[PDB]
Amino acid sequence: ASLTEIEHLVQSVCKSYRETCQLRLEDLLRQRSNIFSREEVTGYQRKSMWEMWERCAHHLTEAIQYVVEFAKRLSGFMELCQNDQIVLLKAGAMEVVLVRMCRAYNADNRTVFFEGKYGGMELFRALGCSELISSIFDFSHSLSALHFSEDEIALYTALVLINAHRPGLQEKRKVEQLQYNLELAFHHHLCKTHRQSILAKLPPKGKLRSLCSQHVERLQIFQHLH
Numbered sequence: 633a634s635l636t637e638i639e640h641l642v643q644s645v646c647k648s649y650r651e652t653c654q655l656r657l658e659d660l661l662r663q664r665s666n667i668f669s670r671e672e673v674t675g676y677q678r679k680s681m682w683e684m685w686e687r688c689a690h691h692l693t694e695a696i697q698y699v700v701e702f703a704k705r706l707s708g709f710m711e712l713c714q715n716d717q718i719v720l721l722k723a724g725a726m727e728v729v730l731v732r733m734c735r736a737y738n739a740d741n742r743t744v745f746f747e748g749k750y751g752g753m754e755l756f757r758a759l760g761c762s763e764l765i766s767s768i769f770d771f772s773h774s775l776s777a778l779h780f781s782e783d784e785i786a787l788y789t790a791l792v793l794i795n796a797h798r799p800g801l802q803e804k805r806k807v808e809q810l811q812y813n814l815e816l817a818f819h820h821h822l823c824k825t826h827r828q829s830i831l832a833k834l835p836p837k838g839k840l841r842s843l844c845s846q847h848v849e850r851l852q853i854f855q856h857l858h
């Protein structure tokens with residue numbers, strides 16, 4: 633709405649993000665050295681489809697709850713009706729989860745942090761979702777090339793959540809106000825750090841819609857006759 637409350641907004645969001653991320657970037661980097669041995673990997677591959685789905689679904693659910701907390705710490709979010717909160721939370725929450733998981737990825741050897749160590753795609757063999765796992769790893773790789781700072785992720789994902797072009801909203805104009813403020817903050821921050829160039833190199837989303845839709849499709853296959 634004005635200057636200096638804009639910077640207050642930026643630091644507000646970055647603070648909320650710092651307090652709602654599962655692991656801190658310091659520790660994810662620190663443990664890049666720590667890799668799953670072949671015994672451990674094949675250990676994960678010998679799990680049944682249903683054990684593996686249970687584990688990953690749990691991890692996913694945990695991640696999503698952390699994103700829900702993040703949303704609650706954004707100014708204006710709690711003053712929305714329960715409905716709009718829910719809508720925004722569906723779409724946004726899983727998408728935000730995928731960006732943060734970009735944080736958890738290591739492009740040097742194409743491994744991701746999982747249950748304490750780094751490992752490649754081969755773990756998730758037990759899931760029986762080769763194409764989806766591939767898509768996830770590719771997305772994280774390309775985002776990893778952009779070198780997001782924690783602040784850039786904070787603001788980007790806040791913008792992913794607070795989208796007033798989600799179909800189903802009742803108080804569309806309140807969400808548009810929150811969105812507008814957040815876009816303003818994001819762009820001012822990028823200019824002050826001279827990172828605005830990255831606005832061209834953002835992932836076209838609908839690539840993100842593809843990951844979500846893929847999760848839905850594979851869930852539909854999974855629960856079909858079992």
Ligand SMILES: O=C(Nc1ccc2c(c1)N(S(=O)(=O)c1ccc(F)cc1)C[C@H](CO)O2)c1c(F)cccc1Cl
Pocket residue numbers: 685687688689690691692695729730732733736744745746747756759761764765768769850
């Ligand atoms: O596992 C599935 N989806 C999923 C998406 C995002 C996630 C997670 C899971 N988890 S995770 O388990 O730790 C994880 C999974 C795959 C990775 F490559 C790295 C990490 C948490 C992570 C928090 O940073 O964000 C999945 C999937 F990919 C296919 C079918 C069913 C499921 Cl549940």
